[PDB]
């Protein structure tokens, strides 16, 4: 009874991100992988912090909840 939503998503989540813990919990619970700050380049997505890796998909907390509501990945936003 754990939804597989973020399968294949390697996300860097800034520790200062509002509601960080809740965000981490659901993202991981729903099959996402977090990336350590050192392995920045291995991230497929990055929340907030755009400068860190321009080549990655830019996302936001809202995008995490949107995906969960739709029960699938939506367009990065």
């Amino acid at each position: 009874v754990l939804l597989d939503i973020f399968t294949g998503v390697r996300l860097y989540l800034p520790p200062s991100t509002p509601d960080f813990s809740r965000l981490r919990r659901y993202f991981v619970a729903f099959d996402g992988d977090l990336v350590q700050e050192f392995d920045m380049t291995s991230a497929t997505h990055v929340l907030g912090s755009r400068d860190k890796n321009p080549a990655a998909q830019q996302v936001s907390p809202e995008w995490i909840w949107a995906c969960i509501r739709k029960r699938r990945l939506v367009a990065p936003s």
């Binding site: 009874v1 754990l2 981490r24 919990r25 659901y26 991981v28 619970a29 099959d31 992988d33 969960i68």
Partner: protein, 97 residues
């Protein structure tokens, strides 16, 4: 606003040694989903050491600094998810040969 069970809240875990296949990822998922805390290293906050390997001398050194540690099988965490509740870790304990 989805609501996940909280039966691991207030508990700190450390995943010790090596795990077969995708078990490490699975353990991380359950511990996190049910509001447990994962530690990067065996620090002062660790309360449960999860290991699939036999008892380890490192366990006895860790006990020197952290005497309240419990050593448990992954099966404990899988079972908690399977029953959707905090089961007693004592049922899944790890002891020396």
């Amino acid at each position: 606003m989805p609501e996940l069970p909280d039966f691991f809240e207030g508990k700190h875990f450390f995943l010790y040694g090596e795990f077969p296949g995708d078990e490490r990822r699975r353990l991380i998922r359950y511990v996190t989903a049910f509001n447990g805390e994962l530690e990067d290293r065996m620090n002062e906050r660790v309360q449960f050491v999860i290991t699939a390997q036999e008892w380890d001398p490192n366990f006895e050194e860790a006990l020197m600094e952290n005497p309240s540690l419990a050593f448990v099988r992954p099966r404990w965490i899988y079972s908690c998810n399977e029953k959707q509740k905090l089961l007693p870790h004592q049922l899944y304990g790890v002891v020396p040969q």
